[PDB]
């Protein structure tokens, strides 16, 4: 039962050890998390004809970034 | 560095608690002692769980804080903030 009170623990681990295992733990727990939304402002962005007919292009409608 | 630093004192901290506190049940032992009988990944997963409002990671305010400076340093960073 002694070793079952003493089972490994964090503060046992070197630093760089523990601070491997947090860079791991903080990427999967936050950064995958972490959601923001932009596809629909990027996708407007992308189809809007940026002053095209203004400019000189002698032809017709060129094709714009989303096309 | 810093942030586990800190985080490794208060689990040392928190376990000498628990191992002075142990008299007072055997079962209450088994259910604080889950945490330090983890695997060591799962161990730094549920002491990374104090995001969001669930709010059972045994963390204290000022190391959540910590952190909750740094993520949002770094979303700044990259862009979202």
């Given at each position: 039962?002694?070793?079952?009170?003493?089972?490994?623990?964090?503060?046992?681990?070197?630093?760089?050890?523990?601070?491997?295992?947090?860079?791991?733990?903080?990427?999967?727990?936050?950064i995958e998390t972490e959601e923001?939304?932009?596809?629909?402002?990027?996708?407007?962005?992308?189809?809007?004809?940026?002053?095209?007919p203004p400019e000189e292009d002698?032809?017709?409608?060129?094709?714009?970034?989303?096309? | 560095?810093?942030?586990?630093?800190?985080?490794?004192?208060?689990?040392?901290?928190?376990?000498?608690?628990?191992?002075?506190?142990?008299?007072?049940?055997?079962?209450?032992?088994?259910?604080?002692?889950?945490?330090?009988?983890?695997?060591?990944?799962?161990?730094?997963?549920?002491?990374?769980?104090?995001?969001?409002?669930?709010?059972?990671?045994?963390?204290?305010?000022?190391?959540?804080?910590?952190?909750?400076?740094?993520?949002?340093?770094?979303?700044?960073?990259?862009?979202?903030?």
């Amino acid at each position: 039962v002694v070793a079952c009170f003493r089972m490994a623990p964090l503060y046992n681990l070197p630093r760089h050890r523990a601070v491997n295992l947090f860079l791991q733990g903080y990427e999967k727990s936050w950064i995958e998390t972490e959601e923001h939304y932009f596809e629909d402002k990027l996708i407007e962005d992308l189809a809007k004809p940026g002053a095209e007919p203004p400019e000189e292009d002698e032809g017709t409608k060129r094709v714009d970034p989303l096309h | 560095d810093d942030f586990v630093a800190k985080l490794q004192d208060n689990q040392r901290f928190r376990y000498n608690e628990v191992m002075q506190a142990l008299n007072m049940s055997a079962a209450l032992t088994a259910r604080k002692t889950k945490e330090f009988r983890s695997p060591p990944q799962e161990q730094i997963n549920m002491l990374l769980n104090f995001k969001d409002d669930k709010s059972e990671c045994p963390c204290p305010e000022e190391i959540r804080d910590q952190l909750l400076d740094f993520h949002e340093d770094l979303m700044t960073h990259c862009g979202i903030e």
